[PDB]
């Protein structure tokens, strides 16, 4: 599939094997610039190559399976300049402190519409989310292995201190065809927040809670391009 | 031609008409932000989309032809959190002054190679200098205006603060082809540096006045797709 981002992502079409709920997730660290620094925090995360290439050479912290439900979080820190210590939500499957002053994150797998047609996805970010979405852009269909560095442009992204730290997608969606996602986020200091929801034409309600959305899928010989 | 930056990139083929001496500048204010800010620079440089669409909105200062000669420069500041004025080079053809501790530049036209072989360009800059090369790449051949925003990967970037604020590309190119070239400048406070030379396997000269090598090429009905 082609990397560029679209209003018609194509999506996959897995085989017998169950999805296993959730997203996979790394975390690595993110340091701060030695004492006395002006300012204090490292602006290595919004060098171009730090989503692909420069976040593997920070310290890896985790990689969990299993994210899925609300995975909105507000970190409140009390200092400027400091690693402060907190904890993702359960929805995380990470069950240790981190940094959550500087920190940062790799979310990807796959997801499954209810209904066929229009989304709207609204992303914010404190302070850095970047969402690729659709096969290629994100990843290819059970060959995630190999193409995982190979993302496109972005979809949608978020960052904080921009004319506003807020951005949407809309993109017309198949039900029950599993959709490549791939979403990165940094917090370079003090607070961190991500939000990530979605409203679809089909009613007013907005989803925050995606139990029944992300899914994990496992690479296979042949891979699962989309049938429909 | 594919937009993705390469080690043979494709160059152009212009007819009769002759080609203006140097590169097309076009400068650009940034901004610091509110006073009491922290830090007081502006992170918009380093927005991904600040290259291509994002600087569009901050005030024209001037657009210039001409730009030739030894386009290097080292602006030393004296205060910082502070617009101080300076002047560019006389290459780039600009006889005011301006804030030289905070402001965009973009230089386009096309590098016309004395020798055919491999050419390594060795770029640094303060604080960013961002380099497209080849056409599609860059932009189209003598269809700049309809492909000026459409540029590729980079070729080469430098970000001062990063490990090294160094980069190269090496290239194969051949002797009288036009490559389009396009480098994009910013300062974000305190001292400016654009570093851009290069070195051929034919000697070892290093060439660092583009006299004889940058020039302008008309947009045309038909374009002017390279044909050797
Ligand atoms: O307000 C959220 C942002 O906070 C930023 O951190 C600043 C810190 O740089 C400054 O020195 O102190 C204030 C608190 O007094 C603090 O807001 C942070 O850089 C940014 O990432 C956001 O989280
Ligand atoms: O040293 C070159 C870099 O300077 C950076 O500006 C810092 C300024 O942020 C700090 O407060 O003061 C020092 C001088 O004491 C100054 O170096 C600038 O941000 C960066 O763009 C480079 O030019
Ligand atoms: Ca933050
Ligand atoms: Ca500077």
């Known amino acids: 599939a082609s990397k560029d981002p679209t209003t018609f992502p194509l999506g ?18 993110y340091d701060f610039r030695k004492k006395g620094s002006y300012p204090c925090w490292d602006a290595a995360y ?42 993702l939500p359960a929805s ?3 069950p240790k402190p981190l940094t959550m002053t500087n920190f940062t994150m790799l979310l990807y797998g796959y997801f499954r519409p209810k209904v066929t047609g229009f989304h709207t996805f609204t992303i914010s970010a404190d302070d850095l989310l970047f969402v690729n979405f659709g096969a290629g852009n994100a990843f290819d269909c059970c ?16 960052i904080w ?3 506003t730290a807020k951005d949407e997608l809309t993109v017309h969606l198949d039900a029950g065809v599993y959709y490549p996602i791939r979403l990165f ?3 370079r200091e ?11 034409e ?12 992300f899914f994990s899928l496992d690479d296979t010989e042949e891979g699962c391009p989309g049938l429909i």
Chains 1, 2 share one sequence.
């Open 46 to 87: 919004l060098d171009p190559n730090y989503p692909r290439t420069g976040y593997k050479s920070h310290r890896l912290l985790a990689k969990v399976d299993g994210v899925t439900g609300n995975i909105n979080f507000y970190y409140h820190a009390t200092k400027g300049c400091t690693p402060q210590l907190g904890h």
């Open 143 to 158: 060959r995630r292995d190999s193409s995982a560095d190979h993302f496109g442009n972005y979809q949608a992204y978020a």
């Open 185 to 187: 986020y940094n917090n």
């Open 190 to 200: 003090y607070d961190g927040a991500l939000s990530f929801t979605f409203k679809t």
């Open 92 to 94: 995380y499957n990470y």
């Open 202 to 213: 089909s009613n007013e309600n907005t989803v925050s809670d995606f139990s029944e959305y």
């Open 161 to 163: 201190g921009s004319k």
């Open 12 to 29: 996959c079409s897995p085989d017998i094997t169950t999805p296993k709920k959730g997203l996979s997730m790394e975390l690595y660290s």
